[PDB]
């Protein structure tokens, strides 16, 4: 039922009467969802799409199928002044929903080994990695950021939202006064019903979120932050059961 950035993207395509698009560069090569990459780019204000003077060699359709070359063509914005823009990142990000944030709490993180601190900063560059798959990737926000996370974590800082506060006044900050809280010993099973909520926290405290005003919805799933958070996003996207 939840939009993927793909999808957004090939809606706004295909109000345009555009059918397949092309890209001037390389970079995309051994790609499993060819829009989504590219709409990433996009969003994140390093190209566009142009139209183009002469037909690309190749180029996908709105369902991602290699097909004959296209007319119009993703390029980096170093290559703007010359072609037509046709498909900007203002306009891109002007159709995004309001997907939901997904949260991992840094408080404890001071607590852990030197080796379980590593293990966090790869499983939260993982999830990086599945929500740029699906969505923009700044919807995973890590709260109560410190520098040793910072240094720890390889991924792109620009791209994930942190923030260097506590968990509750990055929601209040934001508008969001209910959350799911991921709890292994929860009584209620994660289902549909909980796919309104506008933040998941994901990793990390429920007591101190409903002190502060947050309504807590504790839910469990039948771990890795970024296996945890695979699930979730297969069951709002793909409309999967918990079974997959």
Do not use: C
């Amino acid at each position: 039922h939840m939009k993927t950035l793909a999808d957004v993207f090939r809606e706004a395509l295909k109000e345009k009467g555009i059918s397949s698009i092309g890209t001037l560069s390389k970079r995309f090569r051994k790609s499993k969802n060819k829009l989504q990459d590219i709409a990433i780019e996009i969003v994140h204000g390093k190209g566009a799409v142009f139209r183009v003077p002469e037909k690309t060699a190749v180029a996908w359709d709105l369902n991602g199928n290699r097909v004959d070359g296209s007319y119009y063509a993703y390029a980096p914005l170093a290559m703007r002044e010359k072609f037509e823009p046709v498909l900007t990142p203002e306009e891109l990000r002007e159709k995004l929903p309001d997907w939901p944030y997904f949260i991992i709490d840094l408080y404890h993180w001071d607590k852990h080994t030197q080796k379980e601190k590593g293990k966090i900063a790869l499983q939260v560059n993982q999830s990086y990695g599945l929500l740029r798959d699906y969505f923009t990737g700044s919807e995973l926000a890590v709260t109560w950021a410190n520098e040793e996370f910072r240094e720890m974590f390889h991924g792109p800082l620009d791209r994930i939202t942190t923030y260097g506060g506590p968990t509750s006044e990055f929601l209040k900050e934001n508008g969001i006064n209910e959350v799911v809280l991921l709890d292994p010993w929860a009584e209620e099973v994660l289902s549909e019903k909980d796919f309104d909520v506008k933040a998941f926290i994901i990793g990390g405290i429920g007591e101190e979120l409903e002190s502060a005003g947050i309504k807590v919805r504790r839910r469990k799933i039948v771990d890795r932050i970024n296996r945890i958070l695979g699930i979730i996003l297969k069951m709002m996207v793909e409309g999967k059961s918990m079974d997959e």
